Short mmCIF file of C-alpha atoms in Angstrom, two decimals:
data_model
loop_
_atom_site.label_atom_id
_atom_site.label_comp_id
_atom_site.label_asym_id
_atom_site.label_seq_id
_atom_site.Cartn_x
_atom_site.Cartn_y
_atom_site.Cartn_z
CA UNK A 1 12.40 -0.94 -2.29
CA UNK A 2 11.89 0.12 0.79
CA UNK A 3 10.52 -1.82 3.85
CA UNK A 4 10.38 -2.32 7.66
CA UNK A 5 11.62 -5.61 9.22
CA UNK A 6 11.14 -6.80 13.03
CA UNK A 7 14.95 -8.39 14.22
CA UNK A 8 15.59 -10.37 16.89
CA UNK A 9 19.50 -10.19 17.93
CA UNK A 10 21.64 -9.87 20.73
CA UNK A 11 23.30 -6.69 21.63
CA UNK A 12 26.59 -6.51 23.30
CA UNK A 13 26.55 -3.56 25.38
CA UNK A 14 29.85 -2.41 27.16
CA UNK A 15 30.49 -1.13 30.45
CA UNK A 16 31.14 2.48 29.48
CA UNK A 17 27.30 2.90 28.65
CA UNK A 18 25.76 1.46 31.43
CA UNK A 19 24.91 4.57 33.33
CA UNK A 20 22.12 5.32 30.25
CA UNK A 21 19.02 3.13 29.84
CA UNK A 22 18.89 -0.42 28.07
CA UNK A 23 16.82 1.06 25.25
CA UNK A 24 18.96 4.12 24.27
CA UNK A 25 22.73 1.84 24.41
CA UNK A 26 21.11 -1.17 22.49
CA UNK A 27 19.65 1.89 19.80
CA UNK A 28 23.15 3.09 19.32
CA UNK A 29 24.85 -0.29 19.14
CA UNK A 30 22.76 -0.97 16.90
CA UNK A 31 23.40 2.05 14.69
CA UNK A 32 27.30 1.24 14.69
CA UNK A 33 26.96 -2.27 14.17
CA UNK A 34 24.43 -2.58 11.20
CA UNK A 35 23.35 0.87 9.87
CA UNK A 36 25.33 1.57 6.78
CA UNK A 37 26.03 -1.93 5.61
CA UNK A 38 24.59 -4.24 2.75
CA UNK A 39 23.27 -7.35 3.65
CA UNK A 40 22.80 -10.21 1.39
CA UNK A 41 18.92 -11.30 1.62
CA UNK A 42 17.44 -8.15 2.46
CA UNK A 43 19.30 -5.40 0.76
CA UNK A 44 20.81 -2.16 2.59
CA UNK A 45 20.47 -1.37 6.30
CA UNK A 46 19.33 2.18 6.05
CA UNK A 47 18.34 3.33 9.71
CA UNK A 48 17.58 1.47 12.83
CA UNK A 49 13.55 2.69 13.89
CA UNK A 50 13.20 1.76 17.43
CA UNK A 51 13.52 -1.17 20.02
CA UNK A 52 10.58 -2.51 21.17
CA UNK A 53 11.50 -5.28 24.00
CA UNK A 54 15.00 -5.82 25.18
CA UNK A 55 15.92 -8.29 27.75
CA UNK A 56 18.12 -8.63 31.23
CA UNK A 57 21.72 -8.91 30.66
CA UNK A 58 23.96 -11.87 30.16
CA UNK A 59 27.18 -11.82 31.91
CA UNK A 60 29.67 -14.36 29.75
CA UNK A 61 32.97 -15.24 30.86
CA UNK A 62 35.76 -13.18 29.28
CA UNK A 63 34.69 -9.76 28.58
CA UNK A 64 31.95 -8.34 31.38
CA UNK A 65 29.96 -6.55 28.85
CA UNK A 66 25.99 -7.02 29.16
CA UNK A 67 24.50 -9.00 26.48
CA UNK A 68 21.07 -8.78 25.52
CA UNK A 69 18.26 -10.37 23.59
CA UNK A 70 16.39 -7.18 21.56
CA UNK A 71 13.72 -6.83 19.28
CA UNK A 72 14.00 -3.50 17.11
CA UNK A 73 12.50 -2.54 13.75
CA UNK A 74 15.09 -1.77 10.55
CA UNK A 75 14.31 0.42 7.82
CA UNK A 76 15.82 -1.68 5.00
CA UNK A 77 15.69 -1.28 1.20
CA UNK A 78 15.58 -4.14 -0.98
CA UNK A 79 16.10 -4.42 -4.63
CA UNK A 80 14.42 -7.34 -6.64
CA UNK A 81 15.09 -8.67 -9.96
CA UNK A 82 12.83 -8.07 -12.91
CA UNK A 83 11.28 -5.30 -11.21
CA UNK A 84 10.44 -1.55 -12.00
CA UNK A 85 12.48 1.45 -11.07
CA UNK A 86 11.74 5.08 -11.03
CA UNK A 87 14.49 7.30 -11.02
CA UNK A 88 17.01 9.98 -12.33
CA UNK A 89 20.54 9.42 -14.13
CA UNK A 90 23.11 10.71 -12.06
CA UNK A 91 25.69 10.44 -14.92
CA UNK A 92 26.71 8.64 -17.99
CA UNK A 93 29.71 6.61 -19.32
CA UNK A 94 30.68 4.94 -22.39
CA UNK A 95 29.84 1.82 -21.55
CA UNK A 96 26.43 2.73 -19.64
CA UNK A 97 24.32 5.25 -17.63
CA UNK A 98 23.93 5.45 -14.20
CA UNK A 99 20.27 5.41 -13.00
CA UNK A 100 19.63 6.32 -9.51
CA UNK A 101 17.25 3.98 -7.61
CA UNK A 102 17.52 4.84 -4.07
CA UNK A 103 20.30 4.25 -1.79
CA UNK A 104 22.34 2.91 -4.71
CA UNK A 105 23.04 3.62 -8.41
CA UNK A 106 22.05 1.18 -11.28
CA UNK A 107 23.54 0.53 -14.35
CA UNK A 108 21.91 1.18 -17.99
CA UNK A 109 23.93 -0.77 -20.65
CA UNK A 110 24.41 1.30 -23.65
CA UNK A 111 23.09 -2.03 -25.62
CA UNK A 112 20.31 -1.80 -23.43
CA UNK A 113 19.04 2.07 -23.85
CA UNK A 114 17.54 2.05 -27.17
CA UNK A 115 16.26 -0.80 -29.72
CA UNK A 116 17.98 1.85 -32.21
CA UNK A 117 21.78 2.34 -32.26
CA UNK A 118 23.09 4.61 -29.84
CA UNK A 119 26.13 6.83 -29.88
CA UNK A 120 28.27 8.58 -26.98
CA UNK A 121 28.14 12.48 -27.76
CA UNK A 122 31.19 13.97 -26.47
CA UNK A 123 29.96 17.65 -26.80
CA UNK A 124 28.13 17.48 -23.72
CA UNK A 125 29.13 14.11 -22.61
CA UNK A 126 25.38 12.48 -23.37
CA UNK A 127 23.89 10.07 -25.44
CA UNK A 128 21.87 10.28 -28.67
CA UNK A 129 20.03 7.95 -30.70
CA UNK A 130 21.04 7.47 -34.28
CA UNK A 131 17.28 7.70 -35.90
CA UNK A 132 15.08 8.73 -33.06
CA UNK A 133 16.58 11.91 -32.04
CA UNK A 134 15.95 11.12 -28.89
CA UNK A 135 19.14 11.92 -26.20
CA UNK A 136 20.15 11.25 -22.42
CA UNK A 137 21.55 14.04 -20.45
CA UNK A 138 22.62 14.37 -16.53
CA UNK A 139 19.64 15.28 -14.96
CA UNK A 140 16.72 13.30 -17.19
CA UNK A 141 13.91 11.33 -15.48
CA UNK A 142 13.49 7.94 -16.79
CA UNK A 143 11.80 5.02 -16.09
CA UNK A 144 13.54 1.71 -16.51
CA UNK A 145 13.40 -2.42 -15.30
CA UNK A 146 15.76 -3.80 -13.26
CA UNK A 147 17.40 -6.96 -14.60
CA UNK A 148 20.32 -8.09 -12.51
CA UNK A 149 21.76 -7.59 -9.31
CA UNK A 150 25.35 -8.53 -7.79
CA UNK A 151 26.39 -8.28 -4.21
CA UNK A 152 30.18 -8.56 -3.46
CA UNK A 153 30.39 -7.57 0.26
CA UNK A 154 28.44 -5.66 3.08
CA UNK A 155 29.99 -2.65 1.48
CA UNK A 156 26.92 -0.61 -0.54
CA UNK A 157 29.62 0.85 -3.07
CA UNK A 158 31.24 -2.42 -3.92
CA UNK A 159 27.88 -3.85 -4.76
CA UNK A 160 26.40 -2.94 -8.11
CA UNK A 161 22.84 -3.47 -10.18
CA UNK A 162 22.32 -3.39 -13.88
CA UNK A 163 18.86 -2.29 -15.40
CA UNK A 164 17.38 -3.01 -18.90
CA UNK A 165 15.49 0.22 -20.47
CA UNK A 166 14.72 -0.87 -24.09
CA UNK A 167 11.38 -2.84 -23.01
CA UNK A 168 7.82 -1.65 -23.89
CA UNK A 169 6.63 0.55 -21.22
CA UNK A 170 10.05 1.60 -20.16
CA UNK A 171 11.75 5.03 -21.12
CA UNK A 172 11.86 8.60 -20.80
CA UNK A 173 8.46 9.87 -19.78
CA UNK A 174 8.43 12.10 -23.17
CA UNK A 175 9.15 9.05 -24.95
CA UNK A 176 6.31 7.06 -23.10
CA UNK A 177 3.67 9.73 -24.01
CA UNK A 178 4.79 9.51 -27.55
CA UNK A 179 4.23 5.78 -27.40
CA UNK A 180 1.00 6.34 -25.65
CA UNK A 181 0.26 8.72 -28.99
CA UNK A 182 1.16 5.78 -31.37
CA UNK A 183 -1.30 3.41 -29.31
CA UNK A 184 -4.16 5.96 -29.26
CA UNK A 185 -3.52 6.36 -32.92
CA UNK A 186 -3.79 2.59 -33.60
CA UNK A 187 -6.43 2.26 -31.67
CA UNK A 188 -8.65 5.17 -33.43
CA UNK A 189 -7.65 3.80 -37.08
CA UNK B 1 21.05 -16.82 19.94
CA UNK B 2 21.54 -15.21 16.96
CA UNK B 3 20.06 -12.52 14.33
CA UNK B 4 16.35 -13.61 13.98
CA UNK B 5 13.47 -12.35 12.08
CA UNK B 6 10.23 -11.57 13.93
CA UNK B 7 8.05 -9.74 10.92
CA UNK B 8 8.19 -8.03 7.51
CA UNK B 9 5.95 -5.44 5.95
CA UNK B 10 6.63 -3.20 3.18
CA UNK B 11 6.71 0.75 3.04
CA UNK B 12 5.84 3.13 0.20
CA UNK B 13 8.14 6.30 -0.44
CA UNK B 14 6.51 8.78 1.73
CA UNK B 15 6.66 6.77 4.88
CA UNK B 16 10.73 6.49 4.36
CA UNK B 17 10.66 10.28 3.72
CA UNK B 18 8.89 11.17 6.59
CA UNK B 19 10.92 8.79 8.85
CA UNK B 20 14.47 9.98 7.10
CA UNK B 21 13.34 13.34 8.36
CA UNK B 22 12.76 11.97 11.81
CA UNK B 23 16.27 11.16 11.73
CA UNK B 24 17.75 14.35 10.25
CA UNK B 25 15.85 16.14 12.82
CA UNK B 26 17.34 14.37 15.71
CA UNK B 27 20.53 14.15 14.65
CA UNK B 28 20.37 18.11 14.00
CA UNK B 29 18.80 18.71 17.30
CA UNK B 30 22.08 16.52 18.64
CA UNK B 31 24.33 18.91 16.98
CA UNK B 32 25.88 16.39 14.62
CA UNK B 33 27.31 17.80 11.26
CA UNK B 34 25.47 15.56 8.71
CA UNK B 35 22.57 14.35 9.96
CA UNK B 36 22.28 10.96 7.81
CA UNK B 37 25.57 9.50 6.47
CA UNK B 38 26.07 9.59 2.95
CA UNK B 39 24.17 6.49 1.37
CA UNK B 40 20.94 7.64 3.80
CA UNK B 41 20.88 10.99 2.26
CA UNK B 42 21.33 9.83 -1.27
CA UNK B 43 17.97 7.36 -0.41
CA UNK B 44 16.50 10.56 0.91
CA UNK B 45 17.03 12.60 -2.11
CA UNK B 46 15.84 9.60 -4.34
CA UNK B 47 12.76 9.47 -1.92
CA UNK B 48 11.95 13.18 -1.91
CA UNK B 49 12.36 12.77 -5.96
CA UNK B 50 9.16 10.66 -6.07
CA UNK B 51 7.11 11.19 -2.91
CA UNK B 52 4.26 12.64 -4.92
CA UNK B 53 1.55 11.40 -2.30
CA UNK B 54 1.59 13.23 1.76
CA UNK B 55 2.59 10.21 3.65
CA UNK B 56 -1.11 9.73 5.75
CA UNK B 57 -2.72 10.06 2.68
CA UNK B 58 -0.33 7.71 1.51
CA UNK B 59 -1.16 5.04 4.12
CA UNK B 60 -4.69 5.66 3.07
CA UNK B 61 -4.36 4.72 -0.37
CA UNK B 62 -2.36 1.92 0.71
CA UNK B 63 -5.07 0.71 2.84
CA UNK B 64 -7.92 1.37 0.25
CA UNK B 65 -5.84 -0.70 -2.11
CA UNK B 66 -5.69 -3.56 0.45
CA UNK B 67 -9.50 -3.06 1.14
CA UNK B 68 -10.65 -3.42 -2.71
CA UNK B 69 -8.69 -6.80 -3.93
CA UNK B 70 -7.59 -9.88 -2.22
CA UNK B 71 -5.08 -11.14 -5.07
CA UNK B 72 -2.45 -8.36 -4.40
CA UNK B 73 -0.01 -7.97 -1.94
CA UNK B 74 1.60 -5.25 0.11
CA UNK B 75 4.52 -4.80 -1.17
CA UNK B 76 2.29 -4.38 -4.73
CA UNK B 77 0.13 -1.99 -3.31
CA UNK B 78 3.25 -0.09 -1.92
CA UNK B 79 4.87 0.26 -5.46
CA UNK B 80 1.55 0.97 -7.15
CA UNK B 81 1.49 4.19 -4.76
CA UNK B 82 4.86 4.68 -5.20
CA UNK B 83 4.47 4.84 -9.13
CA UNK B 84 1.07 6.70 -9.56
CA UNK B 85 0.14 4.82 -13.16
CA UNK B 86 -2.53 6.62 -14.91
CA UNK B 87 -3.82 4.41 -17.68
CA UNK B 88 -3.42 0.82 -18.29
CA UNK B 89 0.16 0.82 -19.48
CA UNK B 90 1.73 1.77 -16.48
CA UNK B 91 0.04 -1.22 -14.47
CA UNK B 92 0.53 -3.55 -17.62
CA UNK B 93 4.24 -2.94 -17.01
CA UNK B 94 3.87 -2.96 -13.50
CA UNK B 95 2.22 -6.47 -13.69
CA UNK B 96 4.52 -7.46 -16.22
CA UNK B 97 6.95 -9.52 -14.74
CA UNK B 98 3.99 -10.33 -11.89
CA UNK B 99 2.48 -13.62 -11.98
CA UNK B 100 -0.81 -12.14 -11.74
CA UNK B 101 -2.62 -10.05 -14.55
CA UNK B 102 -5.91 -8.07 -13.13
CA UNK B 103 -8.49 -7.00 -15.48
CA UNK B 104 -8.74 -3.81 -17.16
CA UNK B 105 -11.93 -2.91 -15.00
CA UNK B 106 -9.67 -3.50 -11.78
CA UNK B 107 -7.01 -1.27 -13.28
CA UNK B 108 -10.11 1.49 -13.75
CA UNK B 109 -10.48 0.91 -10.00
CA UNK B 110 -6.94 1.40 -8.94
CA UNK B 111 -6.49 4.64 -11.14
CA UNK B 112 -10.22 5.63 -9.09
CA UNK B 113 -8.69 4.80 -5.72
CA UNK B 114 -5.86 6.92 -6.68
CA UNK B 115 -7.68 9.85 -7.77
CA UNK B 116 -9.46 10.01 -4.58
CA UNK C 1 19.82 -15.90 49.67
CA UNK C 2 23.29 -17.36 50.59
CA UNK C 3 26.26 -17.03 47.98
CA UNK C 4 28.50 -20.34 47.45
CA UNK C 5 32.09 -19.55 47.19
CA UNK C 6 31.95 -19.77 43.15
CA UNK C 7 29.15 -17.27 42.49
CA UNK C 8 31.21 -14.74 45.14
CA UNK C 9 34.33 -15.17 43.28
CA UNK C 10 32.71 -14.89 39.63
CA UNK C 11 30.57 -12.23 41.03
CA UNK C 12 33.61 -10.25 42.08
CA UNK C 13 35.52 -11.27 39.02
CA UNK C 14 32.76 -9.89 36.73
CA UNK C 15 32.42 -6.39 38.84
CA UNK C 16 36.23 -6.22 38.61
CA UNK C 17 36.44 -6.99 35.10
CA UNK C 18 33.59 -3.93 34.21
CA UNK C 19 34.90 -1.36 36.68
CA UNK C 20 38.59 -2.21 35.15
CA UNK C 21 36.76 -0.94 31.96
CA UNK C 22 34.78 1.84 32.63
CA UNK C 23 31.96 1.15 34.53
CA UNK C 24 31.73 3.68 37.40
CA UNK C 25 32.10 2.36 41.19
CA UNK C 26 28.90 1.91 43.30
CA UNK C 27 30.65 3.58 46.41
CA UNK C 28 33.48 5.55 47.82
CA UNK C 29 36.86 3.83 47.66
CA UNK C 30 40.48 5.36 48.52
CA UNK C 31 42.94 6.23 45.98
CA UNK C 32 45.02 4.13 44.99
CA UNK C 33 42.78 0.91 45.21
CA UNK C 34 43.09 -1.97 42.35
CA UNK C 35 39.74 -2.62 40.50
CA UNK C 36 39.70 -6.11 42.35
CA UNK C 37 39.74 -4.77 45.79
CA UNK C 38 37.24 -1.94 44.58
CA UNK C 39 35.00 -4.93 43.60
CA UNK C 40 35.72 -6.81 46.68
CA UNK C 41 34.54 -3.72 48.67
CA UNK C 42 31.74 -3.31 46.36
CA UNK C 43 30.55 -6.96 47.33
CA UNK C 44 31.42 -6.59 51.25
CA UNK C 45 29.36 -3.37 51.46
CA UNK C 46 26.18 -5.39 49.74
CA UNK C 47 25.52 -3.36 46.73
CA UNK C 48 25.99 -6.10 44.04
CA UNK C 49 24.40 -5.51 40.43
CA UNK C 50 24.78 -8.42 39.40
CA UNK C 51 22.74 -11.38 40.02
CA UNK C 52 23.14 -15.07 39.61
CA UNK C 53 20.47 -17.58 37.87
CA UNK C 54 20.19 -21.18 39.51
CA UNK C 55 17.87 -23.82 37.56
#
């Protein structure tokens, strides 16, 4: 889930951008370096916001480009294990369903879709419960729980995320309403 | 001197919305064909799917939720504002994996603060 | 402030290295001048952006 992180960092500013002010040059270098990458501890680097303080450059032998201590805010989205997720199903597959949780997509296994048995109907390439007569189709809006996060590399595409859907308080909003109706009925009896 | 973390704070979906639209307008004025990269625009689509509360009023809601209770953290208020719970079941699910479970009266108070 | 030999050499070398990677020349130079000669001309004129720090 989205958050703002203030990070201190050293920026290698090449001689070709010596003309512009240090703030914009540091902003650009951080856009090229951090933006669009996955970090193991904070999530997905989405957008560099702004730089507050930039230090004077240090010339080190070998390159001639200036190195500056910088302070900046990065808008980063962090998935957290065992939390709640609001999203829509981007697509479905026989092994699992893809749930849009933000910058990256999550996977809901068919064994975690329903307590009831499910079958992958190929007529519309959609899921359908055996006895509940419920169904999932592309574009449906559902609520699920994140249960597993895996991070291979800094590429956001490769890292995968798996969710759960059977547990109480989750499901399609219509099913949530039906469960609320059942709760009201059992409270009234 | 390498990378280091100086601060950390949690934000709502509406803030990410308005910030990414600021980014979008900056890049569009710059003339970029795709103002935000592909992951960024997927995140923007997700944000605009569930940005129920206007950004400034979202800030006011988070600050009110901070003022009301002390056991909750910033991320708790952020995800509460993102969810927009309507009854005890939604907040029970929200706090189900959280170490703390508030009284249902505080749950009514959370719904009231959401209403205002 | 009087530069030592080594400080002068480091400043001129860094300036020439920067010029060789597209850093604009701070003065006017004759055509055909090598980047090292451009840096030396810059130093002799006195327009030196690089500052040495001492303990």
